[PDB]
Amino acid sequence: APDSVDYRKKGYVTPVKNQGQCGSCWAFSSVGALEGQLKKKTGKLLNLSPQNLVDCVSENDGCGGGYMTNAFQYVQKNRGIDSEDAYPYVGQEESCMYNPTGKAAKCRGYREIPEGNEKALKRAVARVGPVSVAIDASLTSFQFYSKGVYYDESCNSDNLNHAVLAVGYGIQKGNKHWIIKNSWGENWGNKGYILMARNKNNACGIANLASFPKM
């Protein structure tokens, strides 16, 4: 696999979104994974509906947390997911209002990456596209990230509290990393992004819960 790849430069990633005061991290992370696959298979790049997921996946808790896999399976069974336009983001749980007329994509299941395996995670990013991952983002260092390849020895790999999206990987001054897309707005980190340490004993549980939709 390439020693470096940036899906943002491939046109696989939509603009940075902002979840606001709702624990919809999982939804945004799932939508991001679906978005990349939609781009790869059809060549079209549009914003999907995280709100569709927040309101409709009964296995997740909406603004109270959830898992990407549940969101993916929901999309398989539901046979689709609305476009951002047909189901805009409001940042609050409400009744499932899925509109079939607005369906912009669907998926046929998902695949999980071997837990703890970063090598497995890299190979997937290289040949599949962006991958939904869960990390520990509870540290003040993280919240205040701004430059360089992020790392903090206090980061717990067993405290997976924020689902994010892995849009690539590379190396910055002899420092391998993952190109991470966040949903805390464009004014957070580096344009809503963060470079996190790669191949450094699973920094923040980066490879503990990685998965991706299949189309």
**Active site (catalytic) residues:** 25, 162, 182
What distance in Å separates the CA atoms of residue 34 and residue 47, rounded to the nearest whole number? Answer: 10
Per rule CB under 6 A, is residue 162 in the interface with ligand IN6? yes
**Contact (CB, 8 A) for 110 and 69:** yes
Residue facing ligand IN6 at closest CB distance: 65
State in angstroms the smallest separation of the CB of 28 from ligand IN6: 8
Among 76, 83, 157, 161, binds ligand IN6 (CB under 6 A): 161
CB-based contact 120:114 (threshold 8 Å) = yes
Candidates 137, 42, 115; CA nearest to 83 is 42
Place of tokens 């040949």: 127
Of 5, 105, 125, 134, the one binding ligand IN6 (CB under 6 A) is: 134
Report if residue 20 touches ligand IN6, rule: CB under 6 A. Answer: yes
Shortest distance in whole angstroms from residue 85 CB to ligand IN6? 22
Residue 12 interacts with ligand IN6 (CB under 6 A)? no
Q: Please report whether residue 65 would count as binding ligand IN6 according to CB under 6 A.
A: yes
Neighbours of 187 (CB within 10 A): 9
| Residue 191, C-beta contacts closer than 8 angstroms, at least 6 positions apart | 16
The identity of residue 114, as a single letter, is P
3-state secondary structure of 22: coil
Give the shortest CB-52-to-ligand IN6 separation in angstroms.
16
What is the closest distance, in whole angstroms, from the C-beta atom of residue 196 to ligand IN6 in the complex? 15
Which residues are at the interface with ligand IN6 (CB under 6 A)? 18-21, 23-26, 61, 64-67, 134, 160-163, 184-185, 188
